[PDB]
Structure formats: structure tokens, C-alpha cells
Amino acid sequence: SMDVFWFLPTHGDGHYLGTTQGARPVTLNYLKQVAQAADSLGYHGVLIPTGRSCEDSWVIASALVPLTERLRYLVAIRPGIISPTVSARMAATLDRLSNGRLLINVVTGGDPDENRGDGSFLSHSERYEVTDEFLKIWRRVLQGEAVDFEGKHLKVQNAKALYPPVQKPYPPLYFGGSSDAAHDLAAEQVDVYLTWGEPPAAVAEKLADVRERAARHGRKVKFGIRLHVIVRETAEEAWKAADKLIEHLEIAPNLWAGVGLGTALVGDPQQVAARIKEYADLGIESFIFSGYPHLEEAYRFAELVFPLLPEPYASL
Amino acid sequence: SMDVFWFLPTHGDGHYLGTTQGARPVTLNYLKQVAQAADSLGYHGVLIPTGRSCEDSWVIASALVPLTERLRYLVAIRPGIISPTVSARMAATLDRLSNGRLLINVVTGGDPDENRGDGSFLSHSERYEVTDEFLKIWRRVLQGEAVDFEGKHLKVQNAKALYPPVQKPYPPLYFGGSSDAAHDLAAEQVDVYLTWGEPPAAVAEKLADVRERAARHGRKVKFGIRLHVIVRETAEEAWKAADKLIEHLEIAPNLWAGVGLVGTALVGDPQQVAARIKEYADLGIESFIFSGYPHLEEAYRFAELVFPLLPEPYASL
Amino acid sequence: SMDVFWFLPTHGDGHYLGTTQGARPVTLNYLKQVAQAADSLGYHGVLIPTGRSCEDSWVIASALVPLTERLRYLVAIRPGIISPTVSARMAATLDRLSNGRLLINVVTGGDPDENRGDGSFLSHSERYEVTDEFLKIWRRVLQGEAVDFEGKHLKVQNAKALYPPVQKPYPPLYFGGSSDAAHDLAAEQVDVYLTWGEPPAAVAEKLADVRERAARHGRKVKFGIRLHVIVRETAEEAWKAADKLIEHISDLEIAPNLWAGVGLVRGTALVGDPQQVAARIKEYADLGIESFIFSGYPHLEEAYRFAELVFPLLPEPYASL
Amino acid sequence: SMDVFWFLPTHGDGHYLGTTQGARPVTLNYLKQVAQAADSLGYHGVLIPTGRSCEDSWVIASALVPLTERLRYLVAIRPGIISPTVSARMAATLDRLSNGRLLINVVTGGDPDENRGDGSFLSHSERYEVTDEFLKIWRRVLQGEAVDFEGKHLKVQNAKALYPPVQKPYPPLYFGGSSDAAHDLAAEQVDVYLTWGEPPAAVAEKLADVRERAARHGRKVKFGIRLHVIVRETAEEAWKAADKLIEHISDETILEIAPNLWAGVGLVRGTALVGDPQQVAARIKEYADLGIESFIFSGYPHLEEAYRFAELVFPLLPEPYASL
């Protein structure tokens, strides 16, 4: 098993970082270009970032659903800024219109200035307490249950979502975060645990922790990894583009941390495929890639790396 | 002027009320049919309801925006269940993707059980206090201000919506409600005051009240009305269709209150229906939000029968 | 087995015949409405008429293909006004973009004024000779053959269509016409034989003729019927609607529930309650008719009316929709 | 006064010529990608090729029209393989559905084997006689006339197209061809005369010739040029990209004829502009100084190069492209 995702640049696109030269603004037309590109090329889905620097994820995901056939949308929900019941009704509606193509990314929100701008004044420990109570109401409501919940942060009485989702029991929950409270939350409620691109040894340390905590609850979770990718026909062109990307550091074999100014895979197709094989051998089944620009690099990655990956990507 | 809206049946559609016979389930395909029908027929916009009994308004409005050209979308926001900054960012994004075709309907939420199901436990006065503080942040945030606000219910620090809306200063605010707090809220913040279908005397009393309260805030508000409509070629067919609607009450000339058994409706021939519309416009009402069962067929019926009797541009479409 | 089609009014739509009152002009928006209506309601396909009084069938069908999911399109080809090779490439392209949703309606062209307006000057016998040679080149080219053909009317040397169709051996061929030469052409080359709405005994006679000729060619052809439909909740409302359709025509039930009023302006129609309409459909189906191409005025509302009133009385999958 | 077109690769796309490696087959999805790219990037229109090696132009242009807003479509008609009345009705329908975005490319058909494959057996002189009679019927039919015409090759009686086009008197006629009979036909009937990418002096001779013949008919025609384009940030990368494009071309199936005018693409099917953005814009400025107002560009791959040309060359071109 392997699910290869791409990325929707709802915060802006371009060729280079740290400059407005060659910048591509977020428009409906260009978002359609990237989304329909990932759709026809055979990517499993697309990840939509969230935050103050982005256009709204739910508006954009809903706008692209009727313009695409098979592509799934990994949409972020932010507990603490919306009612869990309302969030569940939004998820059910979009999952129904998409015929079961919705995936949920649970985002706790790190930036305190951004959280206060949204009206949330919570400590780090309180944010995960809200997410824990949020997901409990959200998951139970989407399964047809009339929820009565009174927790430390959230309180609902007779919460109902009258329109059932297509995916059962609910759209899959993706979650990232390296905190101790985050790993407990992932092991208890989520379906796929996400991590940034770290060296294989450090990733295995994170995975084994979540795997053990989930076993204490009698659960098993799948694993995914997030990686930028600069892949070229030869290794020389790839590193030249990585330098060119940050004009205006190799922490592991072909693992470049320049985008963190998380990390990126830089090299020829065999090198890039070998690092993917190393991550897959650890138990990772989801891969979320990105590249600059997001339109051209979606074709670049599909034409250079897909033939070296397992089916169905080998046949695309 | 005059803006004639239609209605998206996101709570279900059909031929008859109080029965599942002849029901049409809400699907993406059928919502496209109604929306694209209103788009090509020349309706100014379409109203999307909200509530526990509906699919989410924002998902549906966003899905239909890139499938329509001119049609506007009157989407409901519910203060008290979402952060004002986030709601403004949702509004800005949909207004930008739609190229300035977004209209916002401020809905406070009447059902106390439904409000408790969403996590809101507020008295009647408290719901309007939240809406007042919600709108103050929402309006200023969409105007490019980094807002610091600390009220009784809401508090934001450095609230920003980085992507400006297309419509300036922000998408127009439509608002309904007959409470004392509702008329005060409308007179101070909203752009269009909405009312259900009542006899002209009852509407004129409401319109005169808001108009006087808005003058105390140095503003003028436009007025709109929400009305179901059962119009046929002759008056006999219209009343027979009205009777068949509730098989499984005329409180005013051609004003039928049968739909309130599950507001009111205009029933009659085109001249009778057009005459009641002229009466409402003579009171100062410029927006009309109509509906009919089924919403696809009746949208064509109203357009072909009543549009020629309305002012331009509807007379020429 | 049963295929229920609808109709795209590419010549104009409306509520009444013989008047411009309540007319709906052919626009892209209104064509999308009808096509997407038939798509979502579950009709097998939609028939697109041809002629000088219509917009071009190929432009409209190609425009609606990416806007619909399952709906098939019965598009007309006119032998004698286009090269067979070029027509084959058009069919191949539209069938590929549509993922195998193209159906071909072979129209020989009856009106002599319209045929001369297009530059075709052929007698009745010559008209079918051209169609016969056209279909042979068309069918062979779409099967990957480099065709050398030199006939009485058409001549090609090394005719090739490089892009194969999705449907094999080629998009299904529909054909109508009751003449002796038409039945010989249908029994030999086409896939579905079509007929207008006649009384069941009159339909059965044509079907028996084509069925007898096709057995001599070692083939079987399916049969379809073209029928207008005015179905209402009660029989009284249905006949009142039929009267209103032809009210504005200046100076009728030729069979049980078979009304020939639509044959005034430009075949027949089924008028009655849902059980009466479903029974006449069962009679036609008992004769061997497997395709039904229905129409109604207006084409948007009546597509819903027929689906909500008649589909539950038809075989699956229409009974469950 | 400049209209910049792109190209729809309805015959196939890819990264390199002479190889199937990295090839992109013609699909509805990929055609949507290129067409919607040119639409949103601000290209005036897109050219759709014709021939036995292509998918049908009319099906593809009609399929993409309802998926685009401003992009125009330059679609080929081939006289001799379709009735003029039918061809005119097709044009009228597509021009109505597109709200006046249809452009017509008059293609006479050069390949004799391909013409015989379609049933056309005509000499070079006869081919232009058919086109001349075809366009006369086509133009008049689209203007509401019931046309009675009896020529050497075509004959119509009461030819009518009942649905008028949006663009008056008819969708603009584009025409290419360097033959002596071709220049006579262009000077008499068409709106825009097209030429392949030749040195500016050779182009000036063709344009001045057509200009003079059109004055003998009391008309003026606009001029356009067809050019491939390989533009990179620096001149070195552009020539390196040009060399890599024809690396895999077999010598069995077998170059800078002018400053930045490279004839390597003509080894399969004309010429290309190769260089940095300033070099490419300067050669465009030269052709425009001759009187050329339409420019039809293409690049491999056609999706990526549509963005590349718009991001590198549009700012150096006149308005409105300079602000896009």
C-alpha cells in the first residue's frame, strides 16, 4: 500500500522563496490548474494548508470538488475556533457532494498571535484538551449519535448531524505533532499519524512511540510523511535548483533542510525513489509531496518518480 | 430598483408538504440544476438556508460558485458558533472566487434545542449581544484593519483577514428578526432588513420602525421580503395547486398561510401576484426572495409568468 | 432489457405548438439544463435531431460531453455531405473524449430542397446507394483497416483513422426508414432499426420484415421506437394538456392512448395516466422494441415528469431510480 | 495591436522529438490543462491543428468552449471534404455557443496521400479552385443569404444557415500558403494571411506581395506568423534546451538560419525563436515592424511552455500582455 498526495498552494505559489519575482497569486483558475493536474495524473489526493496566510480551506475544497473526478482533498479542521457540531455538518456535506473523497487533517494551531487573532487564548496544554474534546463530539456526531457532552472546554446538548457521511464511520482523521500530548491524542483517536521529513532513524523513533501508545488502547494507526521534493533527471540539476530556490544543509543522504528557512528530497529519480523505499520499509504508507511551482512539479514528479514506485503509480 | 431572488432547497425538495411522496433528495446534481436554472433565467441571486435540517450553506455555495456566471449567493452566517475572524476569511475567499457575488445573511438562531446542540447556551438578549459584537469585528476585519476588540462575549487581538474582499467595504449584510434587539441591530449594522410575508399593513409598521431607528444611527437600510409563491395561468389553477400542496388560511388578498404548517405564499394568476408585489414595493421593499415546490420547475414558472409584469430588467428577460 | 432515451430540443423548445408564446430559444445554458437533467435522472441517452432547422449536432454533443457523466448521445451523420474518413475520425474523437458514450444515427436526408441546399443532387435510389458505400468505408476505417474502396459514388485510397474508438467494433449505428432499400440497408449494416409511433400491429409488420431480412445476413438488429409523451396524474389532465398543446393551430386518437396531434406542426404521442402509458410501452416491448426515444414539451420539465411518473412502472434499472 | 496565440497539441505532446519517451497522449483532461492555461494566462486564442495525425478539430474546440471564458479558438476547415452549407452551420453554432470566440483557419490540404484517403483526387490548381468556390458560398451563407451558386466544382441551390453567427459578417478567416494561387486567394477573400517563421527579409517579400494583390481587389489584409519558441532565463540554457529537444531524432528520418531563428524543429514536421527574453522579444519586435499583428507560438511541453513564455516574454510585449 502507498498513497501519494500532492499540495495545493492556497498561500501563494512561485518559482523562488524570499522574493516576489516569478510569483503566482492564488486564483480560482490557477487552483483549478493544480487540482485538475493532480486529478488526471493519478495522485491519491491533495493537501490544503490552513491558517491566516491562506485562503479558506473549506471554501476552496468545496469549489474544486465538482471540477474533479477521483482526487481526494485532505482538508484541515481547527478545533477551538468552530463548534464541533457545525464542523461535522460541513464535513458530512462535502463528503456527500464529493462521493466520499474527503479527508480530515486535525490542526491544533501553534502560532499564539494567530490564535489570539481568532479569539483563542489557550495554553499549549489547553489546546490539546480542546482538540481531544472536539474530536470526541465530532466522531460520535458523524456516526448518527445524539451527543450530550460536557467537558472542561466544550459543552453540547442534543448535538445531531442529520445527513450521514459517505465514508464510514467518518472521513479519515489525519494528525501531526511531536508533543507528548499530541502522541497520546494520535494513539487514541486518529487514523493516520503524520510527521515531517526527518532522517530515517529519527522517524522510526517517532513511529515506534505512537505505535506503542496506540497498542495500549487496542488500536493500530497508519503512518504518513510530509516532504518537499526537488527531483530532476540528473543529481546535478536537482542541487542547482535547490540552490536557486533559496538564492534570495544536507542533514541526511538526499535529505535537504533548505525549505525550512520542513525538509526536501533532492536528487535524481533513483535517489528519490530509494529514500521513499526507506520510509516505506519503516511502515509509512502516505506520502505528501510539494514542489515549486506546484503545477509544473506535479508533472515533473509524476513523470520521473511514478514509474519507480509501486502500483498503481508504476502504471500511470 | 428590484432584486428578485430564488431559493436553494438544501433541506429537501418535492411536490407536496408533510409527505415523502414525490420527494427529491438534495444531491450535487440537483443543486446544480436549480442554481444554473436561476443563473440563466436572470434571477438576481439565490438564498441558501441554514440550520440543523440543512446541509452546510458554505459547502454548497462554494461548490456552485464556479458553475455559475452571474447568480449571487445569499449565504447565512450564525454568530456564536464560529470565530468572527475565520468567518470573515471564509467570506473573503468565497467573494474572491465568485468575483464579488457573495451576499451574507446574518442568522441569530431561534431554536434553543438547536443552539444547545451546537454548544451555545445563551438567553435571547445574549444571542443578540454576541451577534452585535460578532458583526463589529467581522465588518472591520474585512476592511483591512488589524482589530483589537474586547467585549462581553468576544475578544480578539490583532485579528486580520489578509485577503481583501471584492465587494467594498464588505459583502452586503441581510438580516431578519422582529425582536426589539433585532430592529436595533438591523438599524445599526446591516444593509438590508428582511421580513416574512405579512399583509402590507403589518409590513409597513415594521418598515417604519426600522427606518426611524436607523435614522437615529445616521443610516438608511434597504428592505426585503421572503415569500413563497404559487402562480398559475389562471386563478383557479393556482388555488387548486395550493390545496394539493397541503393535502397530506387566506389571511389577505392572495396571501395564503398554508406553507406555515410545516411563512406565507402568494397565490393567484400573474396579474394578482404582480399586483401584490407592487404593493410591497410601494412600501419601500426592493428585495424579494421567492420559493416554490418543486424549486426547479417553479423557478421557470415564476420567470415566464411574472417577470414580464415586473420592472426592468426582468420585463425584458 | 430496455433503453429509455430523452430528446435535446436543438431546434427550439416551448410550451405550445404553432405559436411563439412561451418559446425557449436554443442556448448553451438551456441545453446544459436538459442534458444534465437526463444525465442525473438516469435516462440511457438523448437523441439530437439534425437538419437546417437545428443547430449542428456535433458541436452541441461535443460541448455537452465533458459536462455530463453517464448520458449517451445519439448524434446524426449525413452521408453525401461529408467525407466518410473525416466522419469516422469525428466519431472516433468524440467517442474517446466521452469514454464510449457516442451513438450514431444514420440519416439519409429526405427533403430535396434541403439536400440541394447542401449541394447533394441524388434520387431516392442514389441516396441509399451513397449511404451503403459510406457505411462500408466508415465501419472498416474505424476497425483499423487502411481502406481502398472505389464504388459508384465514393472512392477512397489508403483511408485511415489513426485513433481507435473506445466502443468496438465502432459506435453503435441507429437507422430509420421504411422503404425496401432502407430495410435492406438496415438488415445488412446497422445495429438498431428505428420506427415512428404507429399502432402495435403496424409496428410489428415492419419489425417482422427487418427481422426476416437480417436473418438472411446472419445478423440480429435491435429495434427502437420514437414516441412523444404527454403523461399526467390522471387521464383527464393528460388529454387537457394535449388539447392545450395544439390550441393555437388552425384548421385524433388513432389508437388506444396513441395521439397524432404532434404530427401537425412537424409522429405520434402517448397520452394518458401512468398506467396507460406504461401498458402501451409494454405492448411495444412485447413486439421486440428495446429502445424508446421519448420527448415532451417543455423538454426540461417533462423529463422530470416522465421519470417521476413512468420510471417506477418500467423494468430495472428504471424502476429503482 | 498584437494578438499572441498558443497551440493545442491535438497530435500528441511530449518533452523531446523523435521519441516516445516522456510523451503525453492527447486526452480530454490534458487538452483541458493546456486550453485553460492559455485562457487564464491571457493568450488571445489557441490554434488547433488538423490532419490525419490529429484528433478532429471541431469536436475538441466544441468540447473546450464551455470550459473557457475568453480564449478564442482558431479551427481549421478543409474545403473539398464537407458541404459548405454544413460547414457554415457548424461555424455558426460554435460561434454562438462561444459568444463570438471562433476563428477560422482555411486549410487546403497538402498531403496527396491524405487527400486521396479522404476521397479527394485533385491537382494543385484544382485544390485552390475548390477552396475559392467553397469560401464564397460559406461567407455569403453566414450573412443570411439563400445562396444559389453553380461553379466548376461546387453547386448549391437555396443554401441557408438559419442561425446567424455572433461575429459579423462572419468569423474571421485566417489563411496560409506561399503558392502563387494561394496569394491570389488570400488577397481576395481572407482577413489574416499567415506565414511560417522565415528570416525577416523573406517575410517582407511575401507580405509586400500579398499587400499588393489585395490592393488590386480594394482590400487590406492583416498578417500573422507561426513560430515555435524555446525561451529560457539565459541564452545558454535556451540553446541547451534546443539541442536536447532533437537529441533522439534518428539520422535516418533526417541550423541557426538567422539570429535566434533555429530550424531544428522542422526535422519532423517550422522554425523556432531561441534565446533569452530580451532576444526573443527583439525578434518579435522585428516581425511586428514588418506589419505582423498575430503571433502563433508553441513549445514542448505545451502546458509548461505556455507558462514559461507568459512569465518571461509577456512583460516585454505591448499591452495588454505587458501587465499580465
Side-chain angles (χ1 to χ4, degrees), chain A residues 199-219 221-262:
Chain A
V203 173
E205 302 283 34
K206 298 180 91 318
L207 294 195
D209 183 23
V210 176
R211 186 167 305 113
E212 171 206 27
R213 304 169 106 106
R216 299 190 175 102
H217 287 114
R219 315 182 54 251
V221 301
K222 297 188 298 179
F223 299 106
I225 196 172
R226 174 72 174 89
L227 283 164
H228 199 77
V229 58
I230 307 181
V231 55
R232 289 299 179 272
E233 300 208 332
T234 73
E236 214 238 352
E237 310 171 349
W239 290 108
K240 198 159 202 162
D243 284 329
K244 182 76 181 176
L245 182 67
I246 64 170
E247 276 185 324
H248 306 93
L249 288 92
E250 184 178 14
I251 63 179
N254 299 123
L255 189 60
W256 184 65
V259 69
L261 300 176

Side-chain angles (χ1 to χ4, degrees), chain C residues 5 37 46 49-50 65 80 102 121 131 183 221 223-224 226 243 249 260 283 302 308:
Chain C
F5 288 75
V46 80
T50 191
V65 151
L102 180 60
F121 300 83
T131 301
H183 283 195
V221 300
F223 300 112
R226 175 73 174 91
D243 284 329
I249 307 182
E283 298 176 31
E302 291 296 276
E308 298 173 328

Side-chain angles (χ1 to χ4, degrees), chain A residues 52-53 55-56 59 62-63 81 83 85 89-90 93 96 113 116-119 121 155 157-159 162-163, chain B residues 52-53 55-56 59 62-63 81 83 85-86 89-90 93 96 113 116-119 121 157-159 163:
Chain A
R52 170 191 45 196
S53 59
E55 302 269 43
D56 181 79
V59 173
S62 304
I81 62 180
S83 293
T85 311
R89 298 189 190 143
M90 300 192 56
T93 297
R96 289 158 66 87
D113 178 279
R116 294 192 304 270
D118 301 348
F121 299 82
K155 175 181 178 184
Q157 174 172 328
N158 199 29
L162 304 182
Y163 296 78
Chain B
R52 172 199 291 175
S53 59
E55 300 267 44
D56 181 78
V59 175
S62 302
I81 62 181
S83 169
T85 310
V86 177
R89 297 188 190 142
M90 299 196 313
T93 298
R96 288 158 65 87
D113 179 51
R116 293 191 301 269
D118 300 347
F121 299 81
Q157 267 189 34
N158 199 78
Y163 296 87

Side-chain angles (χ1 to χ4, degrees), chain D residues 82 86 115 212 223 284 311:
Chain D
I82 195 172
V86 178
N115 293 341
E212 177 208 35
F223 299 106
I284 297 175
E311 297 173 327

Side-chain angles (χ1 to χ4, degrees), chain B residues 94-140:
Chain B
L94 183 51
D95 190 62
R96 288 158 65 87
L97 300 187
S98 68
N99 197 222
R101 291 184 289 145
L102 178 60
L103 302 180
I104 298 300
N105 186 22
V106 184
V107 173
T108 327
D111 198 352
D113 179 51
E114 176 178 334
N115 293 341
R116 293 191 301 269
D118 300 347
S120 185
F121 299 81
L122 301 173
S123 62
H124 179 261
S125 64
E126 291 173 345
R127 286 190 335 260
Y128 284 103
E129 289 168 16
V130 177
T131 302
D132 180 67
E133 299 179 8
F134 183 99
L135 286 181
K136 283 174 182 182
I137 301 172
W138 192 90
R139 294 165 58 201
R140 292 166 55 189

Side-chain angles (χ1 to χ4, degrees), chain C residues 50-235 237-239 241-243 245-265 267-284:
Chain C
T50 191
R52 71 137 67 88
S53 58
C54 294
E55 300 267 42
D56 180 78
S57 303
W58 284 87
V59 174
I60 286 173
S62 303
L64 298 172
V65 151
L67 305 175
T68 44
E69 303 163 321
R70 297 154 313 272
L71 189 73
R72 297 163 182 80
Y73 294 93
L74 183 48
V75 185
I77 64 173
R78 310 134 138 193
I81 61 91
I82 193 173
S83 169
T85 311
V86 177
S87 179
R89 299 193 189 109
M90 299 194 313
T93 298
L94 183 51
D95 191 63
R96 291 159 68 88
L97 301 185
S98 67
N99 198 29
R101 291 185 291 144
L102 180 60
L103 301 179
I104 295 300
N105 187 22
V106 184
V107 172
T108 62
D111 199 352
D113 178 79
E114 177 177 335
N115 294 341
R116 295 192 305 272
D118 299 348
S120 186
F121 300 83
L122 303 173
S123 62
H124 174 266
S125 63
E126 290 175 345
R127 216 140 53 238
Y128 285 110
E129 291 167 17
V130 177
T131 301
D132 179 66
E133 300 179 9
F134 185 100
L135 284 181
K136 291 179 182 176
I137 301 173
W138 192 91
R139 293 165 59 201
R140 291 169 54 189
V141 158
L142 282 179
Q143 300 182 46
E145 196 188 352
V147 172
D148 287 334
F149 188 99
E150 184 178 357
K152 176 177 175 59
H153 301 273
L154 299 180
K155 177 183 181 176
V156 297
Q157 185 174 136
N158 199 19
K160 294 184 293 182
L162 305 183
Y163 295 90
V166 174
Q167 293 173 103
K168 282 64 181 62
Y170 42 77
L173 291 174
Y174 289 62
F175 178 74
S178 52
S179 67
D180 266 4
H183 283 195
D184 274 334
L185 179 73
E188 182 178 317
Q189 305 203 59
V190 318
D191 305 303
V192 181
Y193 172 79
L194 290 179
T195 179
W196 288 95
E198 288 198 339
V203 172
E205 194 179 14
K206 295 182 181 174
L207 295 197
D209 182 65
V210 174
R211 186 154 38 205
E212 153 195 60
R213 305 169 106 104
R216 292 199 303 246
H217 284 113
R219 314 181 53 251
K220 185 249 185 299
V221 300
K222 297 184 60 178
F223 300 112
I225 195 173
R226 175 73 174 91
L227 284 163
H228 202 77
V229 58
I230 306 181
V231 56
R232 290 300 178 271
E233 301 208 332
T234 73
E237 310 171 348
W239 289 107
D243 284 329
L245 182 67
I246 64 170
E247 275 185 324
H248 306 93
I249 307 182
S250 52
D251 306 291
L252 266 184
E253 183 179 14
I254 64 178
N257 301 123
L258 191 61
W259 183 64
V262 296
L264 300 177
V265 159
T268 58
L270 291 182
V271 184
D273 63 38
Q275 282 75 19
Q276 290 177 343
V277 172
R280 308 298 166 264
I281 297 175
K282 188 212 180 59
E283 298 176 31
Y284 286 137

